[PDB]
Structure formats: structure tokens, C-alpha cells
Amino acid sequence: TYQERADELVVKIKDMFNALGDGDISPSAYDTAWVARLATISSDGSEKPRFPQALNWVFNNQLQDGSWGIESHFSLCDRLLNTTNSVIALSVWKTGHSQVQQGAEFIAENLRLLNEEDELSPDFQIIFPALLQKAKALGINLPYDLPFIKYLSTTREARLTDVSAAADNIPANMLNALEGLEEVIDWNKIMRFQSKDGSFLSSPASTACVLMNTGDEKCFTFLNNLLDKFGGCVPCMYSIDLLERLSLVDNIEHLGIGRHFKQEIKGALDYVYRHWSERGIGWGRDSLVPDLNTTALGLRTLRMHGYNVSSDVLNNFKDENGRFFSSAGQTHVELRSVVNLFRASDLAFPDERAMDDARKFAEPYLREALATKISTNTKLFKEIEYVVEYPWHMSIPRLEARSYIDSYDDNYVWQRKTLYRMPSLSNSKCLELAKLDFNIVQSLHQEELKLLTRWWKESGMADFTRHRVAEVYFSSATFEPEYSATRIAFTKIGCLQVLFDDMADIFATLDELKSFTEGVKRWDTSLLHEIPECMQTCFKVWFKLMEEVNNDVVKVQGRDMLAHIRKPWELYFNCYVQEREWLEAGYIPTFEEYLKTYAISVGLGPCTLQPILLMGELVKDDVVEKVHYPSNMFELVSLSWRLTNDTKTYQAEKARGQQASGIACYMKDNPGATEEDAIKHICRVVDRALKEASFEYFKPSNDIPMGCKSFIFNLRLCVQIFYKFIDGYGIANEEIKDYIRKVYIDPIQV
Numbered sequence: 001t002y003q004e005r006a007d008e009l010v011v012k013i014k015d016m017f018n019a020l021g022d023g024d025i026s027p028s029a030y031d032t033a034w035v036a037r038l039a040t041i042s043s044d045g046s047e048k049p050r051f052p053q054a055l056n057w058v059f060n061n062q063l064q065d066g067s068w069g070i071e072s073h074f075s076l077c078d079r080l081l082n083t084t085n086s087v088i089a090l091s092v093w094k095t096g097h098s099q100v101q102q103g104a105e106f107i108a109e110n111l112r113l114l115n116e117e118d119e120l121s122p123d124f125q126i127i128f129p130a131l132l133q134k135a136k137a138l139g140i141n142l143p144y145d146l147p148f149i150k151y152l153s154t155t156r157e158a159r160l161t162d163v164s165a166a167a168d169n170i171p172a173n174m175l176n177a178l179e180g181l182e183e184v185i186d187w188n189k190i191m192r193f194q195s196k197d198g199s200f201l202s203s204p205a206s207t208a209c210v211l212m213n214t215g216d217e218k219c220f221t222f223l224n225n226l227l228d229k230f231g232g233c234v235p236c237m238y239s240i241d242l243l244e245r246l247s248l249v250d251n252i253e254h255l256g257i258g259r260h261f262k263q264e265i266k267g268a269l270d271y272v273y274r275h276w277s278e279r280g281i282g283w284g285r286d287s288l289v290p291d292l293n294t295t296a297l298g299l300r301t302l303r304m305h306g307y308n309v310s311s312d313v314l315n316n317f318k319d320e321n322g323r324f325f326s327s328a329g330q331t332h333v334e335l336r337s338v339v340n341l342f343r344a345s346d347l348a349f350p351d352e353r354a355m356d357d358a359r360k361f362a363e364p365y366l367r368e369a370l371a372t373k374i375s376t377n378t379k380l381f382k383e384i385e386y387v388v389e390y391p392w393h394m395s396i397p398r399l400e401a402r403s404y405i406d407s408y409d410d411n412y413v414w415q416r417k418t419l420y421r422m423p424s425l426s427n428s429k430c431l432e433l434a435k436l437d438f439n440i441v442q443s444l445h446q447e448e449l450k451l452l453t454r455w456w457k458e459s460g461m462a463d464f465t466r467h468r469v470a471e472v473y474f475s476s477a478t479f480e481p482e483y484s485a486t487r488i489a490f491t492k493i494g495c496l497q498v499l500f501d502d503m504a505d506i507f508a509t510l511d512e513l514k515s516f517t518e519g520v521k522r523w524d525t526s527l528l529h530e531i532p533e534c535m536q537t538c539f540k541v542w543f544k545l546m547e548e549v550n551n552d553v554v555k556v557q558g559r560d561m562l563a564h565i566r567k568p569w570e571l572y573f574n575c576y577v578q579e580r581e582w583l584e585a586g587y588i589p590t591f592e593e594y595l596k597t598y599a600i601s602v603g604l605g606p607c608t609l610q611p612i613l614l615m616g617e618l619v620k621d622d623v624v625e626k627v628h629y630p631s632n633m634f635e636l637v638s639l640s641w642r643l644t645n646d647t648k649t650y651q652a653e654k655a656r657g658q659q660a661s662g663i664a665c666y667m668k669d670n671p672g673a674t675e676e677d678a679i680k681h682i683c684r685v686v687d688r689a690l691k692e693a694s695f696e697y698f699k700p701s702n703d704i705p706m707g708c709k710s711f712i713f714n715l716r717l718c719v720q721i722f723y724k725f726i727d728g729y730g731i732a733n734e735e736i737k738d739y740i741r742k743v744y745i746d747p748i749q750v
């Protein structure tokens with residue numbers, strides 16, 4: 001069954017957490033081959049392998065065709081690098097004679113395929129042509145004459161003279177291809193780029209290379225220690241204790257299964273944070289040079305979990321043009337590191353220039369990548385497209401999880417200088433759990449919808465089907481199974497409010513409206529007679545619901561909360577009549593005056609107080625105002641709701657007779673301003689409001705219940721996603737109607 005498989009999945013993924021160390025990463029033929037060339041000189045002048053095991057590994061790990069690398073994952077450049085080097089390793093100690101000839105065949109055959117646009121992995125035209133230089137010297141028989149290989153070697157020899165013309169020698173940004181530049185490297189100065197673990201850029205190949213040219217001890221102890229840990233081979237990079245912890249947590253959170261691993265996540269992040277610094281961070285704790293991807297993931301993930309971290313760390317990757325690079329040790333920019341840069345900028349607090357600068361670079365780079373570089377039908381295209389099309393402040397949790405489940409690759413191989421695997425980060429158990437769990441929870445949601453559609457039918461509110469209740473439901477955002485009573489009360493209150501609003505700005509007369517809110521202020525049915533039949537029915541459905549919800553509230557909260565609960569309702573209806581009082585007077589308020597009334601009339605208060613009081617967390621009398629109205633985070637969300645709503649609905653409301661709006665009031669305050677000027681200013685206000693709410697949300701708090709705070713905060717999402725795709729002609733390009741099937745109706749093939 002599903003629940004059983006998910007439970008055993010949770011168990012195993014918890015093991016994975018508890019086992020986290022320096023990193024799970026695959027051996028590297030290329031890197032281990034280099035380690036194997038290292039020579040010790042016996043007293044009898046005869047040279048033998050310094051690291052017997054590393055040669056033994058290359059000996060026993062020839063694939064089939066017969067190259068070295070990753071069987072299930074073939075790649076031209078990767079196979080060429082791995083096999084050639086492996087061949088050179090065997091040849092040097094003249095052994096593995098069969099694999100040599102066997103692999104020499106694989107190379108010769110495939111060399112005639114490097115032509116010519118089959119994109120080359122980073123620094124291929126430097127580390128490979130160097131492998132072929134040593135191939136000649138050993139007499140290995142290969143087609144060195146191909147017009148293409150002669151071009152790669154040409155560019156390399158041209159790149160060598162550049163280092164000769166460097167008073168400071170090899171630039172820091174070519175350190176990646178260290179071992180493809182031996183003949184122009186100053187071996188004293190190069191050492192200035194050694195990490196505290198003896199390694200160069202965490203690369204075993206590079207570290208072997210400097211070991212061979214210098215006999216440096218630290219280089220040796222890094223390699224020796226690594227081989228002993230990997231049982232006689234080496235990965236393409238190590239350690240990766242920082243990257244692995246961050247990606248694991250991010251991937252799980254992103255897959256929608258973060259709630260099952262709260263304690264294990266806290267342990268992983270605590271570890272990372274102890275190694276956090278204003279300088280940025282690299283793959284592992286011992287990196288000399290930080291990298292953008294790990295730092296960007298660190299920023300976002302750490303901030304997301306309540307850690308105090310500064311966006312200034314990003315500037316360590318920014319140049320004069322405001323452009324970012326992946327790492328001072330290389331020339332190429334990694335697409336992934338730019339995705340993570342953008343995603344980190346999603347969590348910007350107000351006045352964080354670095355976040356602004358990151359997003360101004362990353363976004364166009366990302367859209368550029370989508371247009372030219374990435375193939376459409378791919379998981380990756382689908383992943384990056386969601387990142388830019390539904391950024392954080394409009395990313396609905398379930399929709400975000402459903403979409404990432406489809407783009408998460410559990411059979412992925414990363415490409416640095418060669419291909420490697422990180423089993424914790426590309427993990428089939430994570431993916432399976434994510435799907436099983438999504439289904440499990442989806443069934444719960446179906447049942448809630450059923451209950452909700454039933455209510456809409458029986459309540460007589462028939463006089464907008466489930467399709468209108470489903471959109472409110474969808475908008476609840478807070479999806480965890482424990483919060484069912486909260487989501488249901490929210491949806492009912494929300495559905496009623498859409499009704500109350502149509503009543504307040506369309507159907508009711510000022511008098512009918514006033515009478516209604518008097519009925520609310522009295523909290524009884526004494527004034528039912530003063531209002532038409534249709535509004536009598538609304539009031540009664542509403543009032544009946546209040547009794548039912550309020551009884552449930554006593555159960556969760558442990559005592560009467562009626563006095564707290566009446567306040568948001570009164571404030572909300574009083575603001576409604578105030579809207580109408582202005583309209584009757586023909587008065588257009590100032591932008592500020594306008595917000596005072598409309599920032600409340602938008603209705604964040606009533607749809608949140610009763611529901612948060614049902615989540616389970618105790619809300620003390622003096623805390624109500626700290627988490628609900630008028631706390632800052634609450635105001636800010638209310639503001640984003642109001643203003644964003646204005647931009648997409650002011651045109652249709654003005655044709656219906658309404659006057660006041662964010663657009664009209666701004667234009668009245670600012671002579672000469674057009675509607676376009678108003679919208680532009682408004683969106684800047686909304687943008688800043690979202691960022692300040694994040695700052696308020698993540699701020700340390702002693703007495704504000706986190707669940708309750710989270711439910712308010714994640715209500716900002718629904719408004720942003722709803723109106724984002726209305727194209728200013730009024731045409732809704734994307735509609736909530738379409739996410740409903742994906743999130744609530746279609747299960748995930750298991």
C-alpha cells in the first residue's frame with residue numbers, strides 16, 4: 001500500500017540524513033587515472049606506482065566498448081577524457097596490455113566524432129589536447145591528424161603563450177584546467193592557490209599533477225586520505241559536505257516532502273551554518289575558493305529556515321558589469337548556479353541591492369537559456385521555466401511540488417570536467433516518496449473538496465458551482481493534512497466574502513448595506529427584516545456558519561474566542577459602507593486615505609482569524625494582534641492583496657460605476673500622472689510589500705505561533721498567481737481552473 005511504502009521511504013531517507021558526511025559521489029576514472037601515474041622511486045632506481053590501488057582500480061574498471069566512465073551515461077568528451085588518461089596510466093607502468101589496445105580502439109573510433117558542434121565540456125580544449133600530448137610520448141596509436149583535433153591542440157598551444165605572457169603566471173580563472181598547462185606553470189606561484197586540505201580546487205587530477213611536478217607533501221596527504229576513504233579510487237571532487245547538505249534539503253523541500261524531515265533538516269543546516277561566512281562558501285568546508293551555486297543555495301535555504309544570512313555574500317561573484325560568475329577558479333558559467341542565484345533572489349528583503357543585482361543578471365540569462373540553449377521536452381526546460389514563470393511570491397506549494405516532481409531527475413549525472421554522480425541529490429527514494437506522498441495528501445484534499453461542494457449545494461448559496469469554491473480552496477495555500485478544519489473554514493468564509501463583496505459594490509443600496517453591517521455589529525438576526533430576501537439568505541448562511549466555526553474554535557482554542565472573532569467582521573463591513581459613503585459623496589480620497597479603508601475591505605481579516613484559530617496552535621489573547629491585525633506582516637499582505645487586485649480589476653469596476661481605486665487616487669494625488677504611471681508605482685509598492693512581509697515572516701519571534709504566521713503569510717500567494725497572467729486586454733492567459741486538475745484531481749503515476 002501507499003502509506004506503508006511512504007513510511008519505509010521516510011525511514012530510509014532519514015538514514016541518508018543521519019549518514020551524511022563528506023559526501024556520496026562516484027569514483028572518477030579520469031581523476032583516479034591521474035592519481036595512478038604518480039611514481040615512487042625505489043632505491044634500485046626502478047620507478048613503481050606511488051598509489052598501487054589507483055592503478056588497480058583503472059585496471060578493473062574498463063567498461064565494454066571499452067572506455068572508462070559511467071556505463072549508463074555515455075558522453076563523447078567524458079569517455080575520451082576517462083579512457084585516454086586510463087590508457088596513459090596503464091601504459092606508464094606498462095600493464096593492462098589488453099585494456100590498453102582495447103581502449104585505444106575506442107578512442108581512435110570516437111575521435112572521428114568530436115566533429116564538430118557536439119559541444120565540449122568545460123575546458124575540454126585544454127585538458128584533452130594535453131592528454132594526447134602524453135599519448136604520443138608513450139607511442140599510443142591514435143588518429144592525431146584529424147582536422148578537428150589539430151584545432152583543439154592549436155587553441156591550446158595558443159592558450160599556453162598567454163600564460164607565458166603573464167607576470168603573475170597562470171590566471172586564477174584557468175586553475176580548473178591546471179593539469180592541461182604544465183609547460184607554462186610557475187610551480188612556486190601556483191601553490192598560492194592550494195586549499196587547506198592540500199588540494200587544488202578540490203580536484204584530485206589537478207592535485208596529482210602538482211604532486212608530480214613538486215613532490216608537495218600536502219598534495220600527497222590529500223590524495224592518500226581520499227583514496228583510503230574511497231577504497232582505492234577518487235571522485236572528480238571532494239569533499240562536498242556543504243553542497244550535499246544544502247541540495248539534499250532543498251530538493252526534499254522542493255519535492256513537497258519537507259515536513260517529514262524537520263529534525264533531520266535542522267541538523268543538516270546547523271552544520272552548514274557553522275561554516276557560513278561573508279566570503280561565501282564552496283562545495284566543501286575546506287574550499288579556498290567559494291562558488292556561486294553552493295553560496296546561492298546556502299543563502300536561500302538558510303534564510304528559508306530562519307537563519308540570519310546576508311545577501312552581501314552574493315557580491316563575491318559579481319564583476320564590474322554587474323555580471324556574475326560561478327567561481328574564480330574557472331572561466332565557464334554553470335546554468336545551475338544561475339538558476340540558484342535567481343531562486344535566492346526570490347527571498348529578497350527590502351533594500352537588498354545585491355538581491356536586485358542578482359535577479360537583474362539571472363532572469364535574462366535564464367530566459368535566454370530557455371530560448372536558445374535548452375531543449376523543450378526536457379525535465380530541465382520544464383524546471384527552469386517554472387522558476388521564472390512562477391517565482392516564490394506566486395508559487396503555490398502543491399503546484400510547486402507537483403511541477404518539481406515532474407522535472408526532478410532521479411537518474412541524473414553532473415558535468416564538471418568529466419561526468420560524476422551524487423546519489424543523495426539525484427535520488428530515486430526521494431522521488432518515489434514525493435509521488436506516494438503527493439497522492440496520499442491529494443486524496444485528503446479531494447475529500448475536503450467533496451465536503452465543501454456539498455456545503456455550497458445545501459447552503460442554498462447556489463443562488464457558482466464547485467469551480468468557484470475550488471478556486472478559493474486552491475487559494476488556501478496551506479496544504480498539510482493537519483490543517484483540514486482550517487482550510488474548510490477558510491474556503492467557506494472566502495466563498496461568502498466574494499458574495500458579500502458583490503453585495504457591497506454591486507447589488508445593495510447604501511441603506512441595505514448599512515442594515516447588514518448593523519446585523520453583524522449586533523451579531524444576531526434581529527435586523528433580518530430590513531434587507532431584501534436574497535441578502536437575508538446570505539446573512540443566515542453566514543450566521544449559521546459562524547456558530548459552527550466558533551464552536552470548533554472553542555474546541556481547538558480551549559475557550560471562547562467570540563470577542564476576538566467579531567472584530568474583523570465589523571471592521572470589514574464598516575469599511576464596505578465607507579467605500580459606499582465615498583461613492584455616494586463622489587469623493588476620491590488620497591492614495592493614503594484610500595488604503596486605510598480598502599486595505600482592510602480587501603478582506604484578509606475575516607478569512608484568516610477563525611481559520612488560524614483552528615490550525616491547532618494555541619493563540620493567547622495578547623498574541624491575536626501580534627499575528628493577525630494589525631501586525632506588520634498582516635498589513636503588508638493586506639496591502640499586496642489590495643493593490644494587486646486594483647491593477648487587474650479597476651477597469652471593469654469603473655465601467656460598473658465605482659470611482660475610488662489605487663489608480664484613480666494616485667492620479668488625483670499626482671497631477672499629470674497617467675494610469676500607466678499609477679500602475680508602475682503601484683507594482684513597486686506591491687513588490688516592496690512582498691519583500692518586507694518576508695522579512696517580517698522570517699524575523700525571530702518568541703510568542704507568534706509559526707503555523708498561524710505561515711497561514712497568513714502564504715495567503716499572499718493566491719492574489720499574485722491569480723492576476724499575474726491577465727494580459728491587460730483583460731484576457732486571462734493562465735487560469736486557476738487549469739491547476740485544479742493537476743493539483744487535486746489527477747494522481748501521479750506510481
Ligand SMILES: CC(C)=CCC/C(C)=C/CC/C(C)=C/CC/C(C)=C(\F)COP(=O)(O)OP(=O)(O)O
Binds near residue numbers: 501601607719
Ligand atoms: C480573487 C478570488 C475571488 C479568489 C482568490 C483569492 C481568495 C480565495 C480570496 C478569499 C478572500 C476574499 C473572498 C476576499 C474578498 C473577495 C475579493 C477581494 C475579490 F473577489 C476580488 O474581486 P474584486 O475586485 O471585486 O474585489 P474588491 O475590489 O471589490 O474588493
Ligand SMILES: [Mg+2]
Binds near residue numbers: 501505
Ligand atoms: Mg467587486
Ligand SMILES: [Mg+2]
Binds near residue numbers: 501502504505
Ligand atoms: Mg468591493
Ligand SMILES: [Mg+2]
Binds near residue numbers: 650
Ligand atoms: Mg477590485
